[PDB]
Design a protein around this nucleic acid. Structure first.
Ligand SMILES: [Mg+2]
Ligand SMILES: [Mg+2]
Ligand SMILES: [Mg+2]
Ligand SMILES: [Mg+2]
Ligand SMILES: [Mg+2]
Ligand SMILES: [Mg+2]
Ligand SMILES: [Mg+2]
Ligand SMILES: [Mg+2]
Ligand SMILES: [Mg+2]
Ligand SMILES: [Mg+2]
Ligand SMILES: [Mg+2]
Ligand SMILES: [Mg+2]
Ligand SMILES: [Mg+2]
Ligand SMILES: [Mg+2]
Ligand SMILES: [Mg+2]
Ligand SMILES: [Mg+2]
Ligand SMILES: [Mg+2]
Ligand SMILES: [Mg+2]
Ligand SMILES: [Mg+2]
Ligand SMILES: [Mg+2]
Ligand SMILES: [Mg+2]
Ligand SMILES: [Mg+2]
Ligand SMILES: [Mg+2]
Ligand SMILES: [Mg+2]
Ligand SMILES: [Mg+2]
Ligand SMILES: [Mg+2]
Ligand SMILES: [Mg+2]
Ligand SMILES: [Mg+2]
Ligand SMILES: [Mg+2]
Ligand SMILES: [Mg+2]
Ligand SMILES: [Mg+2]
Ligand SMILES: [Mg+2]
Ligand SMILES: [Mg+2]
Ligand SMILES: [Mg+2]
Ligand SMILES: [Mg+2]
Ligand SMILES: [Mg+2]
Ligand SMILES: [Mg+2]
Ligand SMILES: [Mg+2]
Ligand SMILES: [Mg+2]
Ligand SMILES: [Mg+2]
Ligand SMILES: [Mg+2]
Ligand SMILES: [Mg+2]
Ligand SMILES: [Mg+2]
Ligand SMILES: [Mg+2]
Ligand SMILES: [Zn+2]
Lengths: 51, 102, 49, 86, 120
RNA sequence: CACGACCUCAGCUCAGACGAGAAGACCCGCUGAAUUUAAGCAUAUUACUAAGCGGAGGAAAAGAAACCAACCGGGAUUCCCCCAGUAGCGGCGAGCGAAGAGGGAAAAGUCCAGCGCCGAAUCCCCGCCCCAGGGCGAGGGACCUGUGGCGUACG
RNA sequence: CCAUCUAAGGCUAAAUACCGGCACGAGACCGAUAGCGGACAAGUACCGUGAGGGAAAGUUGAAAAGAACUUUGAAGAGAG
RNA sequence: GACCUGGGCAUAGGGGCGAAAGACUAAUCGAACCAUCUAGUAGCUGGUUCCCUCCGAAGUUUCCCUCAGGAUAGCUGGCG
RNA sequence: CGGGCGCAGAUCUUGGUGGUAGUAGCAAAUAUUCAAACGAGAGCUUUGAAGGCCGAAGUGGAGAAGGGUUCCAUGUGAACAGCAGUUGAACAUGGGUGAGCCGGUCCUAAGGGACGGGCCUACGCCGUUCGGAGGGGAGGGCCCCGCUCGACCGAAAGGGAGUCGGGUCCAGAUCCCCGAGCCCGGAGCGGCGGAGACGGGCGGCCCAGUGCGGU
RNA sequence: UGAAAAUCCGGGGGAGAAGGUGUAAAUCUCGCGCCGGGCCGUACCCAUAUCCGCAGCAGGUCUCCAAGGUGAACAGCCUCU
RNA sequence: AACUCUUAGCGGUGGAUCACUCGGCUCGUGCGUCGAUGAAGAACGCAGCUAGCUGCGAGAACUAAUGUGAAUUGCAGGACAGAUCAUCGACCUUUCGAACGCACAUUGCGGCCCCGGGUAUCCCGGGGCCACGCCUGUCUGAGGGUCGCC
């Protein structure tokens, strides 16, 4: 959780509230990165290309 | 000597001799050689034991104590081990030499 | 069971990703040599052990 | 009884996947693999089964490093040097 | 993205180009899940092999300095020593093989095999 | 009664090396059966095999005579041919079974301990100087409870 | 009496072996129930808790030119 | 109640375990299973693959831990 | 010239196909019916109504072991689901399991198993808190104090600090959202407050004070 | 005669620490504030069709919750969710 | 009529036969090379579309170098078209495994050093380590074991 929280702070420069890791049945770990209240996940999703 | 060479894999059993007896124990002192010490690898008169062919010579009947049990030697007493081992002689005397023209 | 080890769950993850049928373009590649995935397993008829 | 009604009471693993040979022969209570002898330092390889020896001998896997020695041997184990540049 | 063009650059320039290729591959991973484009998905392998190419130049440039730094030293790191074969590394060196005792040095000096020929 | 020498025995993630496992056709050292044959069967045979255990190398092992021989004598070892299904072994039953010579392939011989001479003339480690090959350190050790040179049955 | 050797320490190439391995050549051999279990995603699928057991399965055509289009049918499947 | 029962443990093949039935020990128990020795041996059942031509039997003798078999003589064929 | 050279048999081997045979059979646990919808197609799907059953030692609601995607949405109706199917635990395409306070993790139970030693020709075996110079930590600043000391593994039902309420999804939930907490660890200042700390005897001096109440 | 151990706590002990007249040392004050809590499991079935018995097999497979009426009843019979 | 049987044509069922063969088998020849510098084996992962096989290892369907000289191809797309292929001396080479801090039905539980960050304390991340046996040497020691000096 600390490596994922520090990775998104370096790749996208966003403060993180909490991270919830989860290993999917296909073997991939899925992270639920919750941004700080002063950061909007929609505005970051547009910058990274999700939307 | 096979028990000292097994506990010391990094050394090679050179020889062994008798130092004591008892009703229950026989005591022997085994001479082992560190085949990677420079005082031994740089002496040409003992570089033979540093070769890979002498790995665990005490476990193959090559040391003087173990070679005595093999029954080898020149003469009529040792007709069983002509050709090296007794199994080399047994394999030679039990191999059907089917020639090309026979 | 819900209680799994990481090695078992990682083992089941590989078998879950191999239980996929062959791509359609594979039959055009090898000249219809591989017609179907002969290693398809069903969760009832064949177990993993 | 001894037959059908007894197979229903089978829900306890005796063997699991071994860490050395990857086979499902690692006896749990004995803590010993039934196929490779793990955790013994030496692998069990008996001469009364040529087929069992055939399935797990050298050459049945990848040989990630031994196949490179075969390629390095045919060139004299050349090291340190590089081909002449253009 | 040419190996010959990377061997002239410095260490900080290779790391910057390595970083630029990593932010580019990350954006290609986003396009792979958002639908992307056929012209954009095929660029994934180009960026990957260019990352492998930049990362290769960095490694063999580092070891080239390491093999130069430890040259002449008595003890070299294990990865800088010749990995011929476990059996070959444990053989007598060419120095120790050429060592002759003073007895066979004299035996080879005056009792070596002569060059001769016999008529019949 | 501490301080020294030595002996014996410890500790270390000390400095630097080594061993382990795999494979195992061929090879070396052990261990070891019973089907089978004897028209039963117990010794025998199977077999100093299968399986089991240990250890190697590109080969291994063997090997330079406490040999063969009994001759006008041969001359390390290994292998081939022959000796020879012979000498012999064996409920002398079933069965088993070599060797010397002879002919060939290949051939290569040697090192110590001891004995007693040489001011330990010897070795390792460390730090170096020149060009894998040679030197140096009023550096640290090993070693006289014996290193090296000479020398080994042919004197 | 004669002959022969000098045991209880060490080394040693070459002739010799090689159903494993690496790389080749060949065949009065086998020709898909044969030949290796395996000419094919074969020690695979599959079976047994396990040690282990262990298959079946080669061939359109020179070239997919792999049957556009029309038509009946919900579709397979048909007629052209 | 000498009760029923899960999980974790222990005991392994001439061994275990048995309030004893030779019971149980993975549908296998008066000695589990797996692989190998092993293509184990069988005087005993079964089968033993094209044609035509010619000749053509024996179930009797003696011996045999033989009497469902052999040896032996006789009978048979072929070669001359 | 050389054979793996001729089959009807071997309860032969392998493969294929018959008669039986549209046959046995699709008969355990009371039950279905009407209408409508979608649809090429309906006894079997869906919806409603009706009449029934399981009757809380459920044919109900949740887990453990085991299964391993069987969960969920959509599509398909070839094959399979022993009739059918518009249905499915089938097939195809996607999606889904979020924790300091649930469990593992920590502890040792039976037990397993190293270590010392012994044994074993050996691979190894024996043995398990005993048995070795088995301590690697100090306080105090170069000095004296530490074994009742036997590794470790072994419980998702034993021991073991602390999370509950409401809401939310096609499938997640004590984990996500909101709200209200809690536990443990951490702080040369560990950030403040309070406690320690209430005053006595002499004329500034001097003496106290590591809390206090109730028999 | 019906477990061990981790862990936690109380007391005994008074070795020590603290300042010299207002404080100091010290504080087990949920008095308060500050920071952190990693890794793994987590869907679903759990049985007259998701487990085992070759299967959607009348078999086997450890638990939790459990209403109204009749009745002594967790009996049978009926009903609600 | 049907049904049954026989015969032939045709159509099925079925797979023989024949022809084919990048396979097997056997013989011969040359080499005869694993591993703590982490082997064999195993696990997991890696492709634009990829399940298996095969090839690789987070540089993951291959990097560099050399040779070669226009392709790969199922579909694209794109080649910094020196494409591709071969060679393979550089570099890289996850986890388990002799497997090595202790273990493991646990991605569990520790220790040391260093670096970076929040801020020496702690927390987070990274790097280098910590198995057993044994050899030479160093260092630190032990025992009235044998002495010397007192
Ligand atoms: Mg099932
Ligand atoms: Mg072995
Ligand atoms: Mg000399
Ligand atoms: Mg070995
Ligand atoms: Mg007999
Ligand atoms: Mg007989
Ligand atoms: Mg008998
Ligand atoms: Mg054997
Ligand atoms: Mg070798
Ligand atoms: Mg040779
Ligand atoms: Mg030799
Ligand atoms: Mg014999
Ligand atoms: Mg002779
Ligand atoms: Mg001599
Ligand atoms: Mg020798
Ligand atoms: Mg075949
Ligand atoms: Mg083959
Ligand atoms: Mg139980
Ligand atoms: Mg038995
Ligand atoms: Mg009886
Ligand atoms: Mg036969
Ligand atoms: Mg008869
Ligand atoms: Mg035949
Ligand atoms: Mg026939
Ligand atoms: Mg899915
Ligand atoms: Mg049906
Ligand atoms: Mg539908
Ligand atoms: Mg469903
Ligand atoms: Mg499916
Ligand atoms: Mg534990
Ligand atoms: Mg509990
Ligand atoms: Mg209790
Ligand atoms: Mg749910
Ligand atoms: Mg105060
Ligand atoms: Mg107190
Ligand atoms: Mg659930
Ligand atoms: Mg049932
Ligand atoms: Mg089964
Ligand atoms: Mg009632
Ligand atoms: Mg109840
Ligand atoms: Mg009632
Ligand atoms: Mg007729
Ligand atoms: Mg026909
Ligand atoms: Mg590795
Ligand atoms: Zn194993």
């Amino acid at each position: 959780k600390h490596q994922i929280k520090h990775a998104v702070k370096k790749l996208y420069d966003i403060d993180v509230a909490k991270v919830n890791t989860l290993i999917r049945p296909d073997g991939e770990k899925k992270a639920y990165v919750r941004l700080a209240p002063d950061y909007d996940a929609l505005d970051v999703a547009n910058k990274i290309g999700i939307i | 000597e096979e028990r000292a060479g097994r506990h010391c894999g990094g050394l090679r059993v050179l020889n062994s001799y008798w130092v004591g007896e008892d009703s229950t124990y026989k005591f022997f002192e085994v001479i082992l050689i560190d085949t990677f010490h420079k005082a031994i690898r740089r002496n040409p008169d003992t570089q033979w034991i540093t070769k890979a062919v002498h790995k665990h010579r005490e476990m193959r009947g090559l040391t003087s104590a173990g070679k005595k049990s093999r029954g080898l030697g020149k003469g009529h007493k040792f007709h069983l081990t002509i050709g090296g081992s007794r199994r080399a002689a047994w394999k030679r005397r039990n191999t059907l030499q089917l020639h090309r023209y026979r | 069971a819900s209680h799994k080890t990481f090695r078992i769950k990682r083992f089941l993850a590989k078998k879950q990703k191999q239980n996929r049928p062959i791509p359609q373009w594979i039959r055009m590649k090898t000249g219809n040599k591989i017609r179907y995935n002969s290693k398809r397993r069903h969760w009832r008829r064949t177990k993993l052990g | 009884t001894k037959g059908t009604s007894s197979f229903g009471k089978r829900r306890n693993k005796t063997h699991t996947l071994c860490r050395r040979c990857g086979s499902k022969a690692y006896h749990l209570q004995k803590s010993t693999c039934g196929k490779c002898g793990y955790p013994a330092k030496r692998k069990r390889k008996y001469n009364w089964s040529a087929k069992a020896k055939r399935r797990s001998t050298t050459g049945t896997g990848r040989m990630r490093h031994m196949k490179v020695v075969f390629r390095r041997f045919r060139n004299g184990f050349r090291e340190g040097t590089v081909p002449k540049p253009r | 993205i040419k190996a010959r063009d990377l061997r002239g650059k410095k260490k900080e320039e290779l790391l910057k180009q390595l970083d630029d290729l990593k932010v580019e591959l990350s954006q290609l991973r986003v396009a792979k899940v958002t639908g992307g484009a056929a012209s954009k998905l095929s660029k994934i392998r180009v960026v990957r092999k260019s990352i492998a190419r930049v990362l290769t130049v960095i490694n063999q440039t580092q070891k080239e300095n390491l093999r130069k730094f430890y040259k002449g030293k008595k003890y070299k790191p294990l990865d800088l020593r010749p990995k011929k074969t476990r059996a070959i590394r444990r053989q007598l060196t060419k120095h120790e093989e050429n060592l002759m005792t003073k007895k066979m040095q004299r035996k080879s000096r005056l009792y070596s095999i002569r060059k001769f020929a016999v008529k019949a």
